[PDB]
Amino acid sequence: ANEVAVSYSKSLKAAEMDSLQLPVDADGYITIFDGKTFNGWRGYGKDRVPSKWTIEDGCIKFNGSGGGEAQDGDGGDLIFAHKFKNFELEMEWKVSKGGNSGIFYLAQEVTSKDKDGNDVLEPIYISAPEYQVLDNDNHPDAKLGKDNNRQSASLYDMIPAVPQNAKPFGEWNKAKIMVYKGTVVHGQNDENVLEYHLWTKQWTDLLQASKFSQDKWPLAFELLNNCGGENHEGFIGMQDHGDDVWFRNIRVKVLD
Amino acid sequence: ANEVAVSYSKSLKAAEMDSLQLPVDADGYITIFDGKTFNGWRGYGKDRVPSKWTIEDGCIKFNGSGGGEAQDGDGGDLIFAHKFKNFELEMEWKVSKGGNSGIFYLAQEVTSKDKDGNDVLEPIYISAPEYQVLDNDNHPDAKLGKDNNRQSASLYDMIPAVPQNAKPFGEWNKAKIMVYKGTVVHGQNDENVLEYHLWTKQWTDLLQASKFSQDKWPLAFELLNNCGGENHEGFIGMQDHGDDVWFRNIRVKVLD
Numbered sequence A, B: 001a002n003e004v005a006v007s008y009s010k011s012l013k014a015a016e017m018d019s020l021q022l023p024v025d026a027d028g029y030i031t032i033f034d035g036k037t038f039n040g041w042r043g044y045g046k047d048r049v050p051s052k053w054t055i056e057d058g059c060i061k062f063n064g065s066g067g068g069e070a071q072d073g074d075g076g077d078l079i080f081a082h083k084f085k086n087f088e089l090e091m092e093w094k095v096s097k098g099g100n101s102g103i104f105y106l107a108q109e110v111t112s113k114d115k116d117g118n119d120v121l122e123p124i125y126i127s128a129p130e131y132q133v134l135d136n137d138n139h140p141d142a143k144l145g146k147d148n149n150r151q152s153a154s155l156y157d158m159i160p161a162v163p164q165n166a167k168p169f170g171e172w173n174k175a176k177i178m179v180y181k182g183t184v185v186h187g188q189n190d191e192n193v194l195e196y197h198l199w200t201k202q203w204t205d206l207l208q209a210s211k212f213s214q215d216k217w218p219l220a221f222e223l224l225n226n227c228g229g230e231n232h233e234g235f236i237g238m239q240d241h242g243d244d245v246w247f248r249n250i251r252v253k254v255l256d
């Protein structure tokens, strides 16, 4: 009643063959970040946490040097290495001025083959829908895309948060992401700010009007169109986009 | 509020040890061309402005002799000798019929050594991404490369401007180049016409399919793959391609 066993994987595409005993509250929320350790967390594609992610004042901090998607130095996106299917995630997030990050969900670790048969690790964001994290006032991406669909709590490049009720940079915002049987809801500061349905025609259409369309990015389209793969499941994680950001009170409720 | 100090260098690879006071507007655009002088400007690789660059009717003008890439007489590319990193450039350009120029950004002044240890000044474009300037209706290059990737506002030979909304020759076009933490956007006539991201595998992949691939041109590969050198910064400038072209309303906003 106090704890639940949560399986996790240790390296790229590995079985979840170990478990953590993690606290669960009266309402079924599992605390997945203990404020002290990266137990069950690892870099996307890796068997360790990149050193640019640290733990400070009971937060996961990304320590950013400003190269956008470059993921220079010892970076990369971070996942909690337990695949969820139907779940509700709540967490606090705070971005630096001009900052950019993101909360991924239903992520898969994807590789492609190069021309000579070597592996290429593909970005998490071409399998995983992204809840944007952004300083909506100073980062230029805020003004790109359509209808502010690149502002915080948007489904990135697809659906804007309405209302756009983000608190400004350097302040704690609350996120929610619920996926239940294909229904997806994003929450920002305790309001629902968009909703959508996976694996439907409307899903497909949103993808085709995005940077992940079949003609702009064929592999992304394919992965995202059948989001979560054959089993409709994947990781939560957070983005290395080069900028200081903090995450705390990271909690997940398993739905069924 | 009305001006800001802008450092600039006087000669090849020199420190920016002198400063101009340049007007800034309320949006933080710095006017880098004052309509009247070449202050802060110099030939790429030079300590003076080549005499084929003149000021006429409030514009910076290239006076061309028609030798294409030859750069014959007292020509050469022109830089504003202040390195920028995160910035948004806006300027207007007009071409002669059949004309060709370009707008470089993140440029470095590069030399190599010959076989006897002498210096060879390398072209601006082995380091600097090129926003194509072109009479897309009359210059043959327009129909080359791939999917109109040598038309105006393209990332030259690499990404086409879409939509291709150039005005005809002899008419003013508006350009925009924004580099923010590696994200690059080109604008033409107030539409955003391409977006990419420096220092990614996607960037490497574009280079590898280009004339500056590692196999074809290793030095250019190395410089552009790490565009902007170890500090990811470099010059704005414009191209001598042998043809009359006019540039005006040149403003840069520094972003952080």
Ligand SMILES: OC[C@H]1O[C@H](O)[C@H](O)[C@@H](O)[C@@H]1O
Pocket (backbone or CB within 6 Å): B069, B101, B102, B125, B130, B156, B157, B239, B241
């Ligand atoms: O690729 C760099 C340069 O090479 C050639 O000189 C092209 O004619 C010109 O468009 C381009 O600016």
Ligand SMILES: [K+]
Pocket (backbone or CB within 6 Å): A100, A101, A102, A132, A133, A239, A241
């Ligand atoms: K993001």
Ligand SMILES: [K+]
Pocket (backbone or CB within 6 Å): B100, B101, B102, B132, B133, B156, B239, B241
């Ligand atoms: K050109």
